[PDB]
Amino acid sequence: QRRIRRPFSVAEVEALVQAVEKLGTGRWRDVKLCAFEDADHRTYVDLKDKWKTLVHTAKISPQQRRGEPVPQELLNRVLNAHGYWTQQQMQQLQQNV
């Protein structure tokens, strides 16, 4: 059958992103169960690349319907998002947003 046990994947992670984008901390749980892909943790930027693209590929529309100039927005939003979580300190050091 060659069937591989895969209940979740990057696709599901998408929704998980919309959920953690508020009470995030460091996509630790995301990278762990992203898709059994980075469950071993490769690199901070490596995972950052797969994550930043995971969202940019969603509906960010980096083409602007014009062309392909310089997709910097995806970088500014990815670093802002993560930095926000940590710099947010959970707002109350609790998951109770």
- b/e string for 50-86 if b means 16 or more Cβ within 10 A? bbbebbbeeeeeeeeeeeeeeeeeeeeebeebbeebe
Total domain count, the chain: 1
Q: What is the CA radius of gyration of the chain?
A: 15
SS3 33: coil
Q: Are the CB atoms for 78 and 52 separated by under 8 Å?
A: yes
Distance separating alpha carbons of residues 33 and 71, to the nearest angstrom: 28
* Domain region containing 75: 1-97
Helix then strand then coil, % of the chain, to nearest 5: 50, 0, 50
Method: NMR
Q: Which CATH number belongs to the domain containing residue 83 in this structure?
A: 1.10.246.220
Measuring CA to CA, which residue among 32, 23, 31 is closest to residue 90? 23
Distance separating alpha carbons of residues 56 and 60, to the nearest angstrom: 5
- Packing angle between helix 44-56 and helix 73-88, nearest 10 degrees? 120
Distance separating alpha carbons of residues 3 and 72, to the nearest angstrom: 39
The burial class, CB within 10 Å (0-12 / 13-18 / 19+), for 13 is buried
Measuring CA to CA, which residue among 61, 57, 59 is closest to residue 49? 57
- Packing angle between helix 10-23 and helix 44-56, nearest 10 degrees? 100
